[PDB]
Design a protein around this ligand. Structure first.
Ligand SMILES: [Cl-]
Lengths: 183, 183, 184, 183, 183, 183
């Protein structure tokens, strides 16, 4: 189905050039394009597996020694992609679930499992710092659906030893709602 | 309300003497009285907080250097006590939740949180070995109640860094049901 | 022919969930499903190679970092499966052979070679502790068949440096027979 | 009088073979025949001193480097033998004495002095782990006889620096009686 | 009821001055007042808890940095006090029990438990050296009472890992009786 | 019965002089008399236990500091002696068993157990190098007798932790038969 491509470089100039070349190489969407401390550059792409494998191969080969890391995550639910690049909005104040992991890969995989295994809205996937640091996914919906999504996502991250913590908030206080659902 | 008292000793002779002396107090139930590999003795008591505080106080004193550890868990839901000493029967084949922790204390606290915070049956609390080793609680009910119980118990254990793993089995196979719900 | 699947996990909760999933994934029989000290969980399956490979693949992928070890032992004699889950009953009191190894894998392979290479009854395959610990297989039959089974099993285990000891008891005493053939 | 023979081996296969050979060598009774962690095997025999010395000599010589340890305990009271292999029944619910030691040898010697030095029933001798590990003996009778047995057994074990603890329970509770007198 | 007060000082001159002040502060009896190697001074008092707590408080405050240690042992059977300062006379030649411990506190507590838990005469409590060294208590009476006293005292000391040895001598020889019962 | 004596010398001259006294003793058979690298001399003797113990005493006193090692193996089956000095003939192809050990002592003891415990022909006992190095015994007969001999010899060597490997060849290839049965 859909796939995520991650490419991390030692150079910002190379990161911008390679990001540009990957977008032209296939039908891929740019999800993340940013500098990470201490001067590394991160790119995240979303699209069909074939296009993602092609874009990541183009990027990795042209990167040479500037390549920090590259990764392809296959069979990702389509709603995961706008949750990485931004938000999937929620109307009313409903139950919120937060699953915090180490690494964006564990976070994406757990979020994928949550959307496939429940009827929640995956609101956002957030990287606090880089690809190896603290990440969290936010889900919203009916309290029962959220509890199911939180359980399924926790099992996914826990199997890899990458679960930090998970919480369920049946009806967040108005002062917390915007921070949880928007950031 | 109800309380759990835990007394662990390196002496089987002291364990049996102290277990007997604890039962001299009215309204205390000896939930567990067992030998722990390689030659430790474990006593778990249930009853009113006052009786348990008294029983454990005396037990800790009189054990002296043979005392491995002692603990009092106050405000425990009454259904947790038969789940420690045996089983609360499941009279319908429904969804099962298992939460595994390090230490019996984290397991009892998470089991207590699950019964207070959802509409599940707490089937059993199992200590694989001693009070510091692997423990797990088993819950049963509708998938949505079980998802809520597993989430609430996981948050309780995770706050102490003592969560191992948690699983939800919506429709357990014939061959696994007996082992999960009875042991 | 028949195959043995072994899955060892760091988590009891994962072990029970994965045991359930493996049973639903294919036509496999649960031979062993138990906690091993200091809190590991062990699953052993029996069935056709295809079903075993499928169940073990399902289990290993879903296990992630909870996986301690996994193994598929192909072309196993059918009588080895009930000897792992329990006992194969002994027809009449005769000679007994015991082959002790390090690891259940060396023990299963040795037991399989013994049954294929002689006319003995494979009574049981016993794990004293976990999958990497002391294991032993018990065979029964005529002295000559048992000698042949013990020799063949010892060579199998010895080739891997995993043989502890092997013994042949031609006429077991009343008091030892029950322990050797049942376990007690 | 009667004697106890102990043989500990590094191999289960050798243990079963040597156990069998010792039973054929003389008129000895098999008291214990079991695996001990981490894969050692333990044999305990009872009978006449001559038969025991013969069986243990046969076993030790054939054991070679598989021998962990061997021991012969001479002049043992006959009631000690069924207390090692199982239980001696208690004719009435009465006072109980428990003497816990390091090593089965110190425990057998203390049990033997207790039976010879007082009018108690030696209920059982329990070896929690192996031969060098924690062991305990259980005696039953009237308070005075039990006090005498516990004192005599404690002095025996204490002289060798092998006494863990000793207790006297004049009136054991129903819930403890079964565990003390049966296990 | 009755209580024992222990005050240990680094100075003999301060010991004698504080001993004098404690005797004037309350209705207390001087049980022990002696130099201990390598030049420490020991004071032991007997009396009512209130008077003992008052005398020990007076002593501890005035001792300053000269204080080695101080202790108050409450609920002491009255017969323990003359057994510390001297001897309780023995009516006739019967059985003798000796319980040897590390520390005078373990010895006093074991002696107190023995008199309360049996019909023996507590003959004497002896400190071979100082408050932390080898101590022993001597009891006398019928064999059965002595066995009970020795078991109860041994359990008290053994629970704290302070039991050296305990012995029962049913019919002491003429030549040993005087040494055991008088010193 | 029969026995083997093993004498190892630092000197070839001393070894040959001692071999001469053994050749002159009518009750002692000089089985092997040869140099071992790096210039040690080896004598192997056969005879009854009395004759051997004496030959070893004669050798140990006459050699003094030139003796590297000496060993007496008692209760050796007579067929082992020609298997040490040469071969026990076997012509027609039969099943073959090989038991390999560390040390000639473990090999002789294993070979002796094989001949006593089965109807095989012990063909030869071979030392690849010296007395502490790799050795092997070769047996021939019916497959069932060979299986029994190999099992019994393996248990003998294994008990001493000196078993390398054992093999059974039911139907040897003629090109391998000559090497196994003759060397
Ligand atoms: Cl609101």
């Amino acid at each position: 189905s859909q796939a995520i491509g991650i490419l991390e470089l030692t150079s910002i100039a190379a990161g911008m050039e390679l990001g540009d070349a990957m977008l032209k190489s296939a039908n891929v969407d740019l999800l993340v394009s940013k500098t990470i401390s201490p001067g590394k550059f991160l790119l995240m792409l979303g699209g069909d597996i074939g296009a993602i494998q092609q874009a990541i191969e183009t990027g990795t080969s042209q990167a040479g020694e500037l390549l920090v890391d590259s990764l392809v995550l296959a069979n990702i639910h389509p709603s995961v992609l706008p949750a990485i690049s931004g938000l999937n909005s929620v109307d009313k104040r409903q139950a919120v679930g937060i699953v915090e992991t180490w690494s964006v890969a564990a976070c994406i995989s757990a979020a994928d499992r949550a959307v496939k295994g429940s009827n929640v809205t995956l609101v956002r996937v957030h990287m606090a710092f880089g690809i190896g640091g603290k990440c969290y996914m936010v889900v919203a919906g009916d309290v029962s659906d959220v509890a199911l999504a939180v359980t399924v996502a926790s099992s996914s991250a826990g199997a890899y030893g990458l679960l930090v913590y998970a919480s369920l908030i049946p009806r967040p206080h108005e002062a917390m709602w915007r921070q949880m659902v928007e950031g």
